[PDB]
């Protein structure tokens, strides 16, 4: 374990339902930067329980493209959770700050780098699928960026003010990221690896949009939920995200497969990874 006194708190990186995250320095790792989650100052008994369960969940996750648990604070110390610090933060904010490189002639990013970003996400999801672990909230806002466009999948919950518009809230119900959700999730509220594939399709759409636009952004929440009904009724009235400017038709057809009505017809993450890492390179 690790002593809290050995951590040197530098800045606040975020705040959630049952904890808050700080950038810390460590001078005796056994000047190293890490991210540390601690209880909120109004921490309840309920929050502490959720914190302990989060540690158990994160102890499971061991993959280059999933955030990893480096340690926890000592038994006697106030609770903390330590992970790698991803120095470029939020993938949504990161991509937002770039535009697609102009081949003919302001930080930019190339189409092959967008493929590399998306492939890393697919590799992380491929790993989670081997654990039969369902993410339930895959989106660029839940991905983190490190050095050299390294991507790790995380999950920061559904309460951040910055992304409030990405969730549909009804009193007494689970909060729902409806614009990322497969039709069967919207109608029947249950999540699978196949619905993670659907969300990956939307996440891939985000990446190729350079996070410039909300999925179905000109449709209301009510219209997005009704669209799920049109998938169910299967009478050809359902609608899809449009092809991003940066997205070749061949890659768009991959995305459309992620949004297949039948869960079994959606590509597995192994197929998605292969396409993004290899096939798509002839579309450059
Ligand atoms: O995502 C976490 N927890 C989810 C929720 N439950 C299980 C787990 C999960 C992982 C992966 C997939 C699904 C769920 C989580 C927990 C603690 C900490 Cl400190 C961080 C890292 O925060 C960082 C690291 N670098 C940063 N740079 C700039 C900001 C920033 C924040 C993330």
User: How were these coordinates obtained?
Assistant: X-ray
Residue partners of 264: CB distance under 8 A and separation at least 6: 194
Catalogue the active-site residues: 137
Of 37, 68, 85, at which residue does a domain stop? 85
Same domain for 2 and 128, yes or no, is no
Asked if residues 196 and 143 have their Cβ atoms less than 8 Å apart, the reply is no
Q: Where are the beta strands (DSSP E) in 108-150?
A: 108-109, 143-145
Same domain for 124 and 242, yes or no, is yes
Distance 109 CA to ligand 1 centre (A): 25
Left if phi > 0, otherwise alpha if psi is -120 to 50, otherwise beta: which for 267? beta
Q: How far is CA 168 from the centre of its chain?
A: 17
Distance CA 67, CA 8 (A): 21
Residue partners of 224: CB distance under 8 A and separation at least 6: 178, 179, 186, 216
**Strand-pair partners of 7:** 26
Same domain for 105 and 147, yes or no, is yes
37 annotated ligand binder: yes
Same domain for 156 and 40, yes or no, is no
Same domain for 231 and 247, yes or no, is yes
Distance CA 176, CA 252 (A): 25
Same domain for 16 and 45, yes or no, is yes
Determine whether the shortest distance from the Cβ of 83 to ligand 1 is under 6 A.
yes
Q: Ligand 1: which residue has its CA nearest to atom 3?
A: 155
Closest CA to 137 of 122, 156, 151: 156
Closest CA to 145 of 93, 71, 212: 93
Left if phi > 0, otherwise alpha if psi is -120 to 50, otherwise beta: which for 164? alpha
Distance CA 130, CA 128 (A): 5
3-class DSSP string for 190-259: CCCHHHHHHHHHHHHHHHHCCCCCCCCCCCCHHHHHHHHHHHHHCCCCCCCCCCCCCCCHHHHHHHHHHC
Asked if residues 140 and 203 have their Cβ atoms less than 8 Å apart, the reply is yes
Of 36, 58, 85, at which residue does a domain stop? 85
Range of the structural domain that residue 39 is part of: 1-85
Tokens of 155: 């999950």
Asked if residues 2 and 71 have their Cβ atoms less than 8 Å apart, the reply is yes
Same domain for 10 and 119, yes or no, is no
Kind of pairing between the strands at 80-84 and 69-72: antiparallel
Residue partners of 149: CB distance under 8 A and separation at least 6: 113, 116, 117
Asked if residues 174 and 84 have their Cβ atoms less than 8 Å apart, the reply is no
Same domain for 65 and 136, yes or no, is no
Distance CA 42, CA 24 (A): 21
Same domain for 153 and 282, yes or no, is yes
Determine whether the shortest distance from the Cβ of 67 to ligand 1 is under 6 A.
yes
Distance CA 235, CA 43 (A): 50
Same domain for 68 and 99, yes or no, is no
Task: Say what the alpha-carbon torsion angle 42, 45, 47, 48 is, to the nearest 10 degrees.
Answer: 110
Phi and psi at residue 34, to the nearest 5°:
-135, 165
Asked if residues 125 and 97 have their Cβ atoms less than 8 Å apart, the reply is no
Same domain for 76 and 95, yes or no, is no
Element (H, E) at 49: helix 45-59
Q: Breaks in the chain at C–N > 2.5 Å: after which residues?
A: 30, 105
Distance CA 56, CA 72 (A): 11
3-class DSSP string for 68-117: CEEEEECCCCCCEEEEECCCCCEHHHHHHCCEECCCCCCCEECHHHHHHH
Of 31, 51, 85, at which residue does a domain stop? 85
Q: Please tell me the total count of domains within the chain.
A: 2
Determine whether the shortest distance from the Cβ of 57 to ligand 1 is under 6 A.
yes
Helix 269-277 and helix 249-258, axial crossing angle in degrees, nearest 10: 170
Distance CA 10, CA 24 (A): 5
Tokens of 47: 């929050």
Distance 277 CA to ligand 1 centre (A): 25
Residue partners of 227: CB distance under 8 A and separation at least 6: 183, 216, 219, 238, 239
CB count within 10 Å of CB 147 equals 8
Same domain for 266 and 160, yes or no, is yes
Distance CA 265, CA 195 (A): 11
């Amino acid at each position: 374990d690790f002593p809290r006194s050995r951590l040197r708190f530098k800045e606040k990186l975020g705040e959630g339902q049952f904890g808050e995250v700080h950038l810390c320095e460590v001078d005796s790792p056994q000047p190293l930067l890490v991210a540390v989650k601690i209880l909120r100052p109004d921490a309840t008994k309920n929050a502490r329980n959720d914190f302990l369960k989060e540690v158990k969940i994160m102890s499971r996750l061991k993959d280059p493209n999933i955030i990893r648990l480096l340690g926890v604070c000592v038994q006697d110390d106030p609770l903390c959770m330590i992970t790698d610090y991803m120095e470029n933060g939020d993938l949504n904010q990161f991509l937002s700050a770039h535009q697609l490189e102009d081949k003919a002639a302001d930080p930019t990013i190339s189409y092959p780098m967008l493929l590399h970003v998306a492939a890393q996400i697919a590799s992380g999801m491929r790993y989670l699928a081997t654990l039969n672990f369902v993410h339930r909230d895959l989106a660029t806002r839940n991905c983190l960026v490190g050095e050299n466009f390294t991507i790790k999948i995380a999950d920061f919950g559904m309460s951040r003010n910055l992304y409030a518009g990405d969730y549909y809230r009804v009193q007494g119900r689970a909060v729902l990221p409806i614009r990322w959700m497969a039709w069967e999730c919207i109608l029947m509220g249950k999540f699978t690896t196949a619905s993670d594939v659907w969300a990956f399709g939307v996440t891939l759409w985000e990446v190729l949009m350079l996070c410039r636009a909300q999925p179905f952004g000109q449709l209301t929440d009510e219209q997005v939920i009704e669209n799920a009904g049109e998938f169910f009724r299967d009478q050809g009235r359902q609608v899809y995200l449009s092809r991003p400017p940066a997205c070749p038709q061949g890659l768009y057809e991959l995305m459309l497969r992620c949004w297949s009505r039948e869960s079994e017809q959606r590509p597995p993450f192994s197929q998605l990874h292969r396409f993004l890492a290899e096939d798509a390179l002839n579309t450059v």
